[PDB]
Symmetry: C3
Subunit: 436 residues, 3 copies
Amino acid sequence: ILHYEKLSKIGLVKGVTRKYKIKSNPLTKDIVIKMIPNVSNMSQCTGSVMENYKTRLNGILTPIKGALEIYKNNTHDCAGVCMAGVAIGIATAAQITAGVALYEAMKNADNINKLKSSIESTNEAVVKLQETAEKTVYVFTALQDYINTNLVPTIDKIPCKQTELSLDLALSKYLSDLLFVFGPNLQDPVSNSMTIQAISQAFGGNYETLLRTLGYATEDFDDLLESDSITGQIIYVDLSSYYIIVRVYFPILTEIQQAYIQELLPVSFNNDNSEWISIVPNFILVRNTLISNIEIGFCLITKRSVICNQDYATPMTNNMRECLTGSTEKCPRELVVSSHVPRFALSNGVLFANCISVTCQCQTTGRAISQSGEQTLLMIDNTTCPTAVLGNVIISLGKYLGSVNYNSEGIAIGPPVFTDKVDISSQISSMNQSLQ
Amino acid sequence: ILHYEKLSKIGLVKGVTRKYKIKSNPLTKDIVIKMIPNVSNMSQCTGSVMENYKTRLNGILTPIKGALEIYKNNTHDCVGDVRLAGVCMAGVAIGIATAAQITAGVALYEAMKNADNINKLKSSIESTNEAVVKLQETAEKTVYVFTALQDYINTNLVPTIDKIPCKQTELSLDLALSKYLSDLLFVFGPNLQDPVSNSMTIQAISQAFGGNYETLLRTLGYATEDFDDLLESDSITGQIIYVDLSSYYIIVRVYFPILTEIQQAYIQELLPVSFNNDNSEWISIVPNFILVRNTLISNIEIGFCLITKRSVICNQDYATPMTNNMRECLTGSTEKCPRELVVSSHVPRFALSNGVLFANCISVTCQCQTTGRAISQSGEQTLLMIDNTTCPTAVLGNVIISLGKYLGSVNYNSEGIAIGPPVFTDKVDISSQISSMNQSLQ
Amino acid sequence: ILHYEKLSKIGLVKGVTRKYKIKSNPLTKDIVIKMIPNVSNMSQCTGSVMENYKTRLNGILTPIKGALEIYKNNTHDCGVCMAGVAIGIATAAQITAGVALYEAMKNADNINKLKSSIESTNEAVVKLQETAEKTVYVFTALQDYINTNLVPTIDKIPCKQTELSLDLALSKYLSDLLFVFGPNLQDPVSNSMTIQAISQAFGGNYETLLRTLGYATEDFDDLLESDSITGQIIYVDLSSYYIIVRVYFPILTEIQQAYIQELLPVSFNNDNSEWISIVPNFILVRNTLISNIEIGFCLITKRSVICNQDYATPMTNNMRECLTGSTEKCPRELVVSSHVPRFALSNGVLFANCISVTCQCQTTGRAISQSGEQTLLMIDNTTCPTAVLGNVIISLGKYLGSVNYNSEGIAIGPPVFTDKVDISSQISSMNQSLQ
């Protein structure tokens, strides 16, 4: 376990504890995203930009279909998915799993494609088709709302030639928004790591419409969405009607047993007439009594849990482990140069503060609370006095649960470090030169 | 304190010198953003999308008010003339809080004194049907309401309420609200774990108003000539002080600081130039920007700061430490400066400071126009200084340059220096090097 | 030069080989962006918002003119000839950009000669003739929005305070602008600014610009994604509020005897534990010289690596030895996640860690067993053709290297930790050990 008592003397006070949940058990829903809007109502003077748009869109979609055919021509039946590796050549584990999922989805892709004429004839933003007697499919048209709302009503008021330039500019803008996602960046269409946010760029970035039409099956939906846990996969691309069918995955957040997130709040502390701040990861994964880092920038942090669409556990150095579980002499520290570093923090109703670097006094007696040059921070609680003042704040305090003699015992301190990108190279160079 | 001559001979030519300023002394203005639009003029056949959007917005806005109530329930005015007589904090009922979070809590209570008065206007705030509205708060005070989706409704849906089928207007609306929510979730969604703090930029806040912060700031007022600055450096910040789940409108206190230039504090930029040594090209690895204040030399993490032509602007004192060896290197101990071998052919090879030209004439062909002959660099000179004493007009490829006179040593080009050890700065190189030294130590 | 057989043993399965091509030989074209719309049709409800927008845009554009005028005032014919005394601080890129700016003034004079024509444009794209032979296109920022929404609605409503909507539209446009042409912009001289960023003055619609300019290359998408198509500001006008941009359209020139090799990572067992090796995913080989590349800046395709600049960086000598057969110098990292790839296929040949994923090939009708001394188990049609892993049944080809692959062992490198705090902790521990 983490020893929070010695960690608070270093400047790391306990924060919230959070439960770790990962994406798992994903359901499947199939939708149709039509990249080319229906322009039947505006075709009388749509100009020649429709053909140019079609050619440009082929220029984008053709590599996607080409990369899909590599798996399309290598999946068949021999019971289950039967792969042929000679004609594949280069593929990762994720690519092979995506190919198996692709062949699975081909069974419903055939039935969806059986309604090609219905798919092409769609002229609403969200259209319902009866793909079979007991199941339906939704069709989303990329720019159909724009055409029905702005361009179609203004087909005779504004100059149509101007309408021709408008429609064009709209197409262009849609293509420009697409190309960040569906352009040559999409080297591997056989993948399910692509978020619904990116796929919705084929619909104007409006993933809310897609998901709401599909259905908010779970109460953890927002955490799934922000974590981009709702992923998708392209399973069929048509170069004749310019549509792609996407199998959206709707998973459930599975609480990982015997696992939690611990967050530590850094507090600047005083040592040798200077301010220092200790460098440890702000967040720690503890799973089955094993301590390991957690790339968190990708995860989503809530007040009670940390939601990750992948298991982002990353290794911890033994030295960092020891530092977190008591050996504070191994905890590195960096000198403070920012006038705006945190100086106090509230944990469990009790305050740990550096009262030599900040104004520090008590409300119930009016007297100042003095910090010596030997001690790093102060535990202020109702025992010393039940209300403290730190500049403009007046704070009533609660009891402490740890040692009664917290402020009368000192600890050892670690070595100074510098965490700049260039500082790493210089320290390596000097250490190498020192060794030589 | 920086010795420019040895830096130049290594390849760190002089750059511009800029002052250091920080956000300071923030004035406050209070506004409200109604995250729900008034659909009264087009409510005839809006359908049920209004209710569903209501529930979705309630679901998103509920955690914000839940986090705010942790401070609201626990904030109170301490009694009697003994202390500054401000706000008391039920710290045991708060549990977990940082210095910045508590500070924001205090500013939240402070703003409550005005937020109660603005909440008296609840019926007026509901009645707003324009994208910007001004309201009287008192006979000597005013407040602004911004409608999240009023411009779109009033410009497209109301005029086109009959020319198209009403069902189509239903979809369009639904799509518009869903687009709003999708743009919103990046800021006001579950990413917003701490709404109490005031570190959130006005650009992020404007996402609740369609990303149009320029309207927020213009309507409030261009208080100073530095306006673009406090804007880009993320110095203009706002705080949510009251969330209402019945009218779906939040009150935001916008902060307009003033930029205090720090005295005895300037930012120096160094230009790197590839230099020849041991029959190969190298580039030194030093910070491009260095902060020297109170004769003290420290780095700066300028990525979050704004580098204008004359000053470096930061919404926070972003000064960071610098290694002792880097201080000695920038002081003159030039052998402690690291250098990186360059394999790219697109690294700059010459630079101009004070009108004197530093160049690597081994890598790039140099000749002088006045004498019509080549400018030669020998194998033991890292860089060649060219100035009017050398010749008043030299060329480097396709550029004709006229040079001024040097201010330092007259015999610059005849004096050599020591050179440091090579380094490699790839992400995997650091791990590879650390293993090598560890194995060497064992 | 890369020993792929030995790299497979450490988890680096050989992947796709791609061809390296860099930006070179840029053509030049001239466009004019007028960053304020012409509203002569809706001058009725333009109200006063336009004067405030004029002031705001003048304040925005003044530093750009100031930072161009340093080279405007200090360059003259004496080819291109420049005054370095009054310029003072300048980089190689800045000097080259100023030279190109001077070359562009020759056409900039003729372009400015049509100032009245430029300011009279009332569409998003209008064709103008600067000479008897050459033509120029002019792009106005919000003319489409105006002509499609505000113009029709001006008689479809009693103005309904159109100001409120025009003001907001111009405000949103300026909010979009401030990210690129706002304070951030410090060196408008340099030509490293991408056409995507330039199009923010036109609403981010770079596709219209590139289509109207008439691209005529098959590498157009690779040019656009790799940030190869850049622009340069050559003149600013504060009276009509338009700027001239010289768009550079380059061509992809393949670097001879150069290719980039991709390594696919696969977890491997060692000492009853699972590791992943820390080696760059993409490796550039040029004339039998091996160097790294920050491939995040470039674009990766199925058959080529496209960068707008030569992004080669040096590699440690030890890493070079690691990638050339001596596997003991290759660092490895412990795998504390359950979502690391565990198998990969190379040349129809499967590499997998059968300890961590169950293997039972259907042709033999039995499980595939990996000992406690084999990092990866290699399967091909020589052992049994079709293998099954989890839910995939895959048929396999034949290996081309050593037939005795599974029987030979190798040495393994030392563990590493790649977190930034881990690096600092390792540095501190090594320093303390030295002391």
